[PDB]
Design a protein around this ligand. Structure first.
Ligand SMILES: *[C@@H]1O[C@H](CO[C@@H]2O[C@@H](C)[C@@H](O)[C@@H](O)[C@@H]2O)[C@@H](O[C@@H]2O[C@H](CO)[C@@H](O[C@@H]3O[C@H](CO)[C@@H](O)[C@H](O[C@H]4O[C@H](CO)[C@@H](O)[C@H](O)[C@@H]4O)[C@@H]3O)[C@H](O)[C@H]2NC(C)=O)[C@H](O)[C@H]1NC(C)=O
Ligand SMILES: *[C@@H]1O[C@H](CO)[C@@H](O[C@@H]2O[C@H](CO)[C@@H](O)[C@H](O)[C@H]2NC(C)=O)[C@H](O)[C@H]1NC(C)=O
Length: 424
């Protein structure tokens, strides 16, 4: 009630200790500068950003039951952020750019009206995004850049609990682990996750069709680029300084909405991408694994090997090795005679995926050695059309199906494939 608000405001004045000329002098805090109250003397707004404040924040803040907007940003307030639990009308919370040293796990408990949270640039002790946030079903904006956020990106941030989430900014924290698949379906429009140690692939982006701005640079993301054709509002895509593999997808190259793309410093393969003239492209020379230094089709041998790599799920070691346009110099697993590929030898490379029928297109092949990997599927019939093939070793994989009929002088070894001959 109004007496409770009066007491809480007096406690806040004491903790913050504002200057004598700040205007918190009247016996009725509803008459104080930068405070808004209802006609029945309930506090609804406290708006004292950029006010040079130096104290701490009283825990009695949580007693202001009708508080809607709390702005304390760009001061020098220290100590812990008090629990705000129970402030069911709090709609806007701005604490960015202060000196807060911690934020508690129950801080968002029962904050059902919360729409916008900004707590960037505070020297918080390490903390994880808390479960208490899950009651903010109308949450639209959550910003906590440079706030020492740790752990994984929690899956509860998906549309199942945050159907209105629009801005999620968590740059320059300590996040690790992979993107949770529960983000699928999210209507987030601006996503900042740059500048930490996130890993895994970014396939979940395919299911986030409201994205306009995606900043994932400076992480440890890997794997090939996903299908972008569904992201018809995507304007700004920053993927630089990661470990992405595979080619730049045509689905991205033809995306009409695209305005800015950053691809520098990855392990992207295939031909150099050509974007529309209107797109600002950040792609430093020699900062990926493209076959040429400028746009143009790759060498025929390279094209074949890249199809083979694709079927092997773009092996990370090959993405970093198979650079340039000459497979006969310094490529993992590749030997040549007079420029013709004679050996593809990738034993013990933890390969996944399947054996591409494109092996059959490399007519100079003498040895295909793929033993001790995690390959599945069948041995393609196309391999029997290799007239110089001497040895096919596919030992110790997870292959199945009938072995096609090879010439009677081809050495074939399927040792250690328990399902060879079985159908699946
Ligand atoms: C957070 O919000 C949940 C509901 O949202 C769901 O969980 C969130 C964490 C998040 O995942 C959301 O996306 C998701 O939709 C609230 O949960 C509801 O809480 C109320 C009570 O607080 C429950 O109401 C009770 O229902 C009982 C039957 O299931 C019923 O027996 C109870 O009646 C008894 O109590 C009432 C008074 O409360 C009394 O009037 C009755 O006479 C009787 O004794 C009562 O109605 C809902 O079942 C919960 N689930 C819903 C609504 O889906 C949760 O409270 C909230 N928590 C915080 C901290 O804000
Ligand atoms: C992503 O690339 C864009 C386009 O190159 C970068 O934006 C440009 O930044 C330069 C500064 O280096 C500005 O002077 C240009 O005006 C910007 N162009 C824009 C915004 O269209 C952007 O900085 C890159 N992002 C990262 C994280 O490196």
């Amino acid at each position: 009630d109004s007496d409770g608000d009066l007491s809480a405001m007096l406690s806040l004045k004491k903790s913050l200790n504002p200057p004598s000329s700040f205007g918190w002098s009247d016996p009725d805090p509803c008459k104080w500068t930068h405070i808004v109250c209802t006609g029945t003397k309930r506090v609804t707004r406290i708006q004292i950003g950029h006010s040079g404040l130096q104290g701490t924040l009283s825990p009695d803040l949580r007693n202001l039951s009708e508080l809607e907007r709390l702005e304390l940003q760009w001061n020098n307030i220290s100590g812990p952020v008090p629990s705000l639990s129970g402030l069911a009308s709090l709609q806007v919370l701005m604490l960015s750019n202060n000196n807060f040293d911690s934020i508690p796990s129950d801080v968002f408990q029962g904050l059902t009206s919360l729409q916008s949270v900004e707590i960037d640039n505070n020297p918080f002790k390490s903390w994880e995004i808390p479960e208490s946030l899950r009651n903010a079903s109308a949450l639209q904006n959550f910003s906590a850049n440079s706030a020492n956020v740790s752990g994984s990106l929690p899956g509860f941030l998906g549309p199942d609990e945050f159907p209105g989430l629009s801005i999620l900014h968590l740059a320059f924290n300590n996040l690790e682990g992979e993107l949770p698949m529960s983000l699928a379906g999210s209507q987030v429009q601006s996503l900042w996750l740059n500048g930490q140690k996130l890993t895994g692939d970014i396939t979940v982006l395919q299911n986030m069709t409201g994205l306009k701005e995606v900043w994932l640079h400076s992480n440890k993301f890997s794997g090939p680029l996903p299908d972008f054709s569904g992201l018809k509002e995507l304007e700004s895509l920053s993927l630089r300084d990661n470990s992405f593999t595979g080619p730049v997808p045509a689905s991205l190259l033809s995306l009409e909405s695209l305005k800015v793309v950053n691809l520098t410093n990855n392990h992207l393969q295939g031909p150099v991408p050509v974007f529309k003239s209107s797109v600002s492209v950040d792609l430093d020379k020699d900062s990926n694994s493209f076959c040429l230094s400028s746009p143009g089709e790759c060498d025929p041998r390279v094209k074949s090997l890249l199809l083979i790599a694709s079927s092997f799920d773009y092996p990370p070691r090959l993405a970093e090795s198979w650079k340039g346009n000459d497979p006969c110099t310094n490529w993992i697993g590749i030997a040549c005679s007079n420029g013709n590929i004679t050996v593809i030898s990738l034993e013990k490379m933890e390969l996944t995926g399947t054996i591409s029928p494109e092996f059959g297109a490399i007519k100079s092949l003498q040895r295909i050695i793929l033993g001790i990997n995690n390959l599945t599927g069948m041995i393609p019939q196309e391999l029997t059309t290799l007239p110089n093939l001497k040895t096919l070793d596919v030992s110790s994989n997870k292959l199945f199906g009938k072995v096609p009929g090879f010439r009677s002088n081809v050495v074939v070894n399927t040792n250690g494939n328990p399902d060879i001959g079985k159908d699946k």
